[PDB]
Amino acid sequence: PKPYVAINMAELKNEPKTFEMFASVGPKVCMVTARHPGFVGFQNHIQIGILPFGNRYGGAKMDMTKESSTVRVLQYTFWKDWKDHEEMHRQNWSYLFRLCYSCASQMIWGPWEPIYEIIYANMPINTEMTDFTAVVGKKFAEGKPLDIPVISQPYGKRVVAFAEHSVIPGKEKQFEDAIVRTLEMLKKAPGFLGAMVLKEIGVSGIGSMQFGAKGFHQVLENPGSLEPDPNNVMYSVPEAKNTPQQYIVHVEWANTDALMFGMGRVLLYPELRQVHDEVLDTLVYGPYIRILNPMMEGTFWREYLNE
Amino acid sequence: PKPYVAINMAELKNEPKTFEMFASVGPKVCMVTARHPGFVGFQNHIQIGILPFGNRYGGAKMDMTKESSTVRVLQYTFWKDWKDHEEMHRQNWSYLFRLCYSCASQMIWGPWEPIYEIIYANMPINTEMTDFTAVVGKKFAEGKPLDIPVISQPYGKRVVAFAEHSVIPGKEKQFEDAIVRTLEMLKKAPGFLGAMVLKEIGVSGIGSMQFGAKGFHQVLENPGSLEPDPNNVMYSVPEAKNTPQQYIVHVEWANTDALMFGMGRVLLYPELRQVHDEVLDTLVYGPYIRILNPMMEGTFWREYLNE
Amino acid sequence: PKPYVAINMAELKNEPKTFEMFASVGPKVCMVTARHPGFVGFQNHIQIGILPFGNRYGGAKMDMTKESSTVRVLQYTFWKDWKDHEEMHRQNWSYLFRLCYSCASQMIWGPWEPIYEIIYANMPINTEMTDFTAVVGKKFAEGKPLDIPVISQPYGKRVVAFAEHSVIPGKEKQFEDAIVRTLEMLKKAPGFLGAMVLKEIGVSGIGSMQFGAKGFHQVLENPGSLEPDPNNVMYSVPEAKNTPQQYIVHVEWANTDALMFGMGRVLLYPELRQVHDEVLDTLVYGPYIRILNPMMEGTFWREYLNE
Amino acid sequence: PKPYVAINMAELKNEPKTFEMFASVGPKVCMVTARHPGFVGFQNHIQIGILPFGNRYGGAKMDMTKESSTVRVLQYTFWKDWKDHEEMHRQNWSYLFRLCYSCASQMIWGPWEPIYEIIYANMPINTEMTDFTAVVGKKFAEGKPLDIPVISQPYGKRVVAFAEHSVIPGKEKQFEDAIVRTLEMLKKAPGFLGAMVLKEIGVSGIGSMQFGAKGFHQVLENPGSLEPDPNNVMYSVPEAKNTPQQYIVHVEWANTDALMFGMGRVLLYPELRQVHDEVLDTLVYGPYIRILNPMMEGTFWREYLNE
Ligand SMILES: [Cl-]
Ligand SMILES: [Cl-]
Ligand SMILES: [Cl-]
Ligand SMILES: [Cl-]
Ligand SMILES: [Fe+3]
Ligand SMILES: [Fe+3]
Ligand SMILES: [Fe+3]
Ligand SMILES: [Fe+3]
Ligand SMILES: [Zn+2]
Ligand SMILES: [Zn+2]
Ligand SMILES: [Zn+2]
Ligand SMILES: [Zn+2]
């Protein structure tokens, strides 16, 4: 079934100490999150650059890692019910806060953790290049050659286009219909590894360290080993849902050239350009496309999705 | 009277070429904007850093200019009626688009131009250190010594705390009442040069280069000397107003230490801390405080404000 | 009214890591202390050098920062009642101990936190150079030009002479009478920014991490996240008051030259020299004068003082 | 009363030897000029750069001193009657010629010395920052707080905008009326230190070393110690007055940013822009704005002006 998705977003200093912290803290946070039976997996990204759209963002390029002073992370966690995410944070608060707070010395902005429903998904299981022979064998044995996926390699061996949009109130249905038509056509591009559309349903105050005054002071005053009051979050997830309505169109690609020219198909192929124009007409903001590297992940989230 | 404020926001590469184009393009855009009789002035900022709040943003500091790969600009233009801003962009589109588009090679994100109403203002005219003797003389001559302002020096000789907030729906009145009480007390801090509260009323699609499909293609395909269709903006300013409601609390200071400890008065002085806690209880997002340098400005906007 | 003063004293390694810790830990401690309604502010100092008194301390100079292997801090906190300080430490012990203990890797001596009553004060509110025009305007408007203070700039922009004395038992009244007469004359010196006389009333065992055996072992054995028993302090504040009676004469100055020659007025101006000789005749120890930089402060303590 | 102004203009090599000869010769010339009772003072400038007007003069900047191969000087001398200037040169010719001729090895162009009448003046006395307290005290004692000026610091501690204009024949009255209205509004800009409008009345042949054939040969053949015949000047001052009529608009500012944005007020503030447009409509040449540093001056010229 379709899980819900929480995306924890932050910006940190681009230096070795940050990546060192990622290496010790990140695995711990993942293991704590896996304590909850509603957890179905995760996919953690670092932003490597920005799609320049020709020279619309002429100061940007798809790989800015060697020049950037900051690193942006987008950590997706997948949940049977979005309420599971909220419960997980509260049940494991002593561990999670103290773990997450240890990133403090490196933080510039965040964390900010919106929650999304998946309104469209065409996403395969991941496989390594060693796996395909057995996958092919099994699918033919089962009489299901149509179920043989493209090879979508895990652990930093493919790239993601993360396309941000916000939509004019009243045009949500037009956007959703047109973006699905667009992605159904886009899947013909070489190196296409899948797509999904995430629709924001709210924001996790607890995941964003956004408390009332009491919790705010506890966070600012913290030596690192004392929890802020998790009950001091002043708003429910849906109370923070944005209008204009926000969407992420998440598309995965074999490599950055396939991404550039593949995403570009919505601009270069007349038939698809006409369809995609119906998406463009609905926007308040965007499209703004971040280029992400899915480095650390729990690939079994796609098994839940495709079961 | 209180003008409306449009704030054009963008992120560009932090390199000499960017600042060079600021120097040639910036003055031109300002002169074009001044063609409209509803224009009452401007105050252009570069972000120099971020308030770390102890080590809540421990990777940040108040002056990050020597290490940052990007520069963020926040250009305030002030208008008798916000409709004047929209009219100005459309009446002068050929010049403005071609001027603004010349920044393309340096752009990473933006432009994004929300529009604000000022719901509270305690902001003095600017004066240089050479002026105070005549100002004092004139105010005493007029029998109005209470109208003698602090010395708020123009053109990069003071600093701004730009504090971003979004508020839980239904708590807007509580936020507004508490922030005004907070700022009325905050004015006692040494080096305080004024404050105002900006409440978002919408976003300028034209100022944000956010068009329908037709205009988007025209932007992407532009050699630099052809206007997109300015009539192809698909939403009015108020249609893009955010919920949760966004506010900027803009506070000016003699220097970065006065800013750090002055803004800190809302955390360190028990009486003010209690009042400011009422603000904190209302938030979905924030406070996040950017440190800005008001470099290029048309100081006469404060003459309109205080007339 | 006159607050009481706790002065937390420590000596630490003079290296970047110490100043980095100051930057993250210091603000947190200040915010925790502000939790108590009897807290009226603070003034934190680093010692920059020692007054050489000609060549009496010929190895010393007013600014020894570039050569010294250690840095001494003197953190003043101001309290409506000295009992408020003791209550604050105990009410906020879990945060304060863990925060203060994080300074351990840098500590050479301390902390030691004597408590003082203020027996004489002539101390103005602080103002930045931008503020004076409004201050002058307001005072004249109120018909109180005599209430216009000198400009005492906050946040490291003036210097302090911290003059240590201990007095022969039985000569306390002579010392107190003579030092007040001295300071009343000293205020004529150029660049004089105020003075106060602090008389020790005791020592905070809890602030000095001075426990009985149980708490001592807990401190020595601490991983950093476990409180010693705050009830294991074996003496009350007044039980630790010193005899010979100790006093600090705290005098503020525009700059170090004004300090040197201004404090020197008590040696160089015959009329004042005769008065100051009455102070000198009472001493067991001193005068020993430390030169301090008041870097981080909550200036509103002077508002409480002068209200 | 308003004095007349002679402005001796020259261009010399930008090298130490030039500035060395400024230091020995300049004072001597000033002392000789002061022999005449009609001399009321002087204000000598070096051009430090050119106002680029955005990128209209994109090769220029306000401070070109580090890159320029030449230095332009503009030496103002002030006279009760312009005839006094002519008489002074002739009465002191042996000294002046031999002094002025010693600059020869450094000269590239000039000297050229037009004479001007002041048709508008709003110019304060100069004061150092040490003076303002006594000035304020005296003006209040006299009951004339409106006579307290801005602080216009002498000797290289402010900057001058030297704005060249020539006017269409028959439009002189329109120019003069509009420029006065403009300057009366301009005085509101922060850091404005005064303005005056100079109208050319002719050129001093003797000050410009412009003789008939006899004197020209004597100049060219001079060993440095023999006067050309001062009676060999072939034209009177008014005979050389230019048509189109030339004007200098001379505006003084606290610093180059105040100059740039202050002068810019005539382009950026719609109300002033409309008035200044009446000036622009009258021009044959200009505005061309030189940025000057008033280094060596006899400040008492402003005492004569304002008496
Ligand atoms: Cl797109
Ligand atoms: Cl805040
Ligand atoms: Cl002494
Ligand atoms: Cl001009
Ligand atoms: Fe989360
Ligand atoms: Fe705009
Ligand atoms: Fe203490
Ligand atoms: Fe002359
Ligand atoms: Zn798209
Ligand atoms: Zn706040
Ligand atoms: Zn003494
Ligand atoms: Zn002009």
Q: What is the DSSP string of B162-212?
A: EEEEEE-TT-HHHHHHHHHHHHHHHTTSTTEEEEEEEEEEEE-TTTTT---
- Using CB atoms within 10 Å of the CB of residue D122, give its burial: 0 to 12 exposed, 13 to 18 middle, 19+ buried: middle
Residue B100 CA to its chain's centroid (Å): 18
The answer to whether residues C80 and C13 touch, using CB atoms and an 8 Å cutoff, is no
Name which of C24, C37, C138 is nearest B270 (Cβ-Cβ): C37
Say whether residue B122 is in contact with chain D using an 8 A CB cutoff: no
**Experimentally determined by:** X-ray
Residue D48 CA to its chain's centroid (Å): 14
Structure token digits, residue B275: 């009042």
Nearest-angstrom CA–CA distance, A190 and D34? 88
Q: What angle do CA D25, D31, D32 make, to 5 degrees?
A: 90
Check CB contact under 8 Å for D264 and B27: yes
Nearest-angstrom CA–CA distance, B301 and D51? 24
Of D4, D8, D43, the C-alpha closest to D294 is D43
SS3 state of residue A205: coil
Which residues, other chains included, contact A255 with Cβ-Cβ below 8 Å and sequence gap of 6+? A158, A159, A191
| CA D165 to ligand 6 center in whole angstroms | 34
Residue B77 CA to its chain's centroid (Å): 8
Which chain A residues contact residue C104 at CB under 8 A?
A: none
Secondary element (H or E) of residue D45: strand D39-50
Which residues, other chains included, contact A24 with Cβ-Cβ below 8 Å and sequence gap of 6+? none
Check CB contact under 8 Å for A222 and C28: yes
Of D67, D64, D43, D72, the C-alpha closest to D252 is D43
Check CB contact under 8 Å for B145 and C133: no
Say whether residue B187 is in contact with chain C using an 8 A CB cutoff: no
Structure token digits, residue D221: 């053949």
Secondary element (H or E) of residue B60: none
Nearest-angstrom CA–CA distance, A173 and A170? 8
Nearest-angstrom CA–CA distance, A233 and A214? 9
Strand partners for B79: B4, B39
State the DSSP string of B72-124. EEEEEEEESSHHHHHHHHHHTHHHHHHHHHTTGGGEEEEEE-EEEEEEEEE-P
Nearest-angstrom CA–CA distance, D246 and D167? 7
Of A262, A255, A250, the C-alpha closest to A305 is A250
The answer to whether residues C73 and C45 touch, using CB atoms and an 8 Å cutoff, is yes
Nearest-angstrom CA–CA distance, B252 and B272? 18
Nearest-angstrom CA–CA distance, D145 and D154? 22
Backbone angles phi, psi at A200, to 5 degrees: -65, 135
Nearest-angstrom CA–CA distance, D180 and D199? 13
The answer to whether residues B37 and D270 touch, using CB atoms and an 8 Å cutoff, is yes
- Scan for tokens 């708490």, then name that residue: C215
Nearest-angstrom CA–CA distance, B252 and B186? 11
C295, C297, C299, C300 alpha-carbon torsion, rounded to 10°: 180
The answer to whether residues D54 and B31 touch, using CB atoms and an 8 Å cutoff, is yes
Distance from CA of B129 to the nearest CA of A (A): 35
| CA D287 to ligand 4 center in whole angstroms | 5
Number of neighbours of residue C63 by Cβ within 10 angstroms = 14
The answer to whether residues D34 and D292 touch, using CB atoms and an 8 Å cutoff, is no
Which chain B residues contact residue D189 at CB under 8 A?
A: 299
Nearest-angstrom CA–CA distance, B272 and B253? 18
Nearest-angstrom CA–CA distance, B102 and B31? 16
Nearest-angstrom CA–CA distance, B8 and B46? 11
The answer to whether residues B227 and B233 touch, using CB atoms and an 8 Å cutoff, is no
Nearest-angstrom CA–CA distance, C40 and C28? 17
| CA distance between the termini of chain D | 7
Check CB contact under 8 Å for C98 and A226: yes
- Scan for tokens 């261009």, then name that residue: D11
Structure token digits, residue A166: 């916000």
Alpha carbon distances (Å) from A267 to A253, A261, B216: 17, 9, 11
SS3 state of residue D182: helix
Nearest-angstrom CA–CA distance, D58 and D291? 15
Nearest-angstrom CA–CA distance, B79 and D241? 47
Resolution, Å (one decimal): 1.7
Helices D172-186, D270-280: axis angle to 10 degrees equals 160
Nearest-angstrom CA–CA distance, A59 and A57? 5
State the DSSP string of D48-96. EEE--TTTTTTT--S--TTT-SEEEEEEEEEESSHHHHHHHHHHTHHHH
Secondary structure letter of residue A243 according to DSSP: B
The answer to whether residues B176 and B167 touch, using CB atoms and an 8 Å cutoff, is no
Secondary structure letter of residue A58 according to DSSP: T
Pairing of strands B114-122, B107-112: unpaired
Secondary element (H or E) of residue A232: none
What is chain A's percent helix, strand, coil content, to nearest 5? Answer: 35, 30, 35
Q: For residue D124, say if its preceding peptide bond is cis, omega within 30 degrees of 0.
A: no
- Using CB atoms within 10 Å of the CB of residue A137, give its burial: 0 to 12 exposed, 13 to 18 middle, 19+ buried: exposed
Structure token digits, residue D218: 């004597």
Alpha carbon distances (Å) from B135 to A207, B144, B153, C132, D293: 52, 11, 14, 13, 26
Helices B213-220, A270-280: axis angle to 10 degrees equals 120
The ligand with the least distance to the CA atom of B275 is: 10
Of C162, C130, C150, C149, the C-alpha closest to C191 is C150
Which residues, other chains included, contact B293 with Cβ-Cβ below 8 Å and sequence gap of 6+? B45, B46, B47, B48, B156, B159, B160
Of C209, C241, C221, C4, the C-alpha closest to C89 is C209
Structure token digits, residue A238: 């849906």
Nearest-angstrom CA–CA distance, C21 and D304? 62
- Scan for tokens 């000022």, then name that residue: B118
| CA D182 to ligand 12 center in whole angstroms | 8
Alpha carbon distances (Å) from C68 to B304, C61, D143, D174: 55, 11, 56, 71
Secondary structure letter of residue A287 according to DSSP: E
SS3 state of residue A67: coil
- Residue type for D250, please? H
Nearest-angstrom CA–CA distance, D52 and D160? 15
Of D40, D258, D245, D67, the C-alpha closest to D161 is D258
Residue of A103, A221, A225 best to disrupt the C interface, most CBs of C under 10 A: A221
Structure token digits, residue B188: 């006692």
State the DSSP string of A78-115. EESSHHHHHHHHHHTHHHHHHHHHTTGGGEEEEEE-EE
Breaks following residues of chain A (C-to-N distance > 2.5 Å):
none
The ligand with the least distance to the CA atom of A86 is: 5
Which residues, other chains included, contact B273 with Cβ-Cβ below 8 Å and sequence gap of 6+? B266, B267, C34
Number of neighbours of residue D63 by Cβ within 10 angstroms = 14
SS (H, E, C) chain C: CCCEEEEEEEEEECCHHHHHHHHHHHHHHHHHHCCCCCEEEEEEEEEEEECCCCCCCCCCCCCCCCCCCEEEEEEEEEECCHHHHHHHHHHCHHHHHHHHHCCHHHEEEEEECEEEEEEEEECCCCCCCCCHHHHHHHHHHCCCHHHCCCCCCCCCCCEEEEEEEEECCCCHHHHHHHHHHHHHHHCCCCCEEEEEEEEEEEECCCCCCCCCHHHHHHHHCCCCCCCCCHHHCCCCCHHHCCCCEEEEEEEEECCHHHHHHHHCHHHHCHHHHHHHHHHHCCEEEEEEEEEEEEEEEECCHHHHHHC
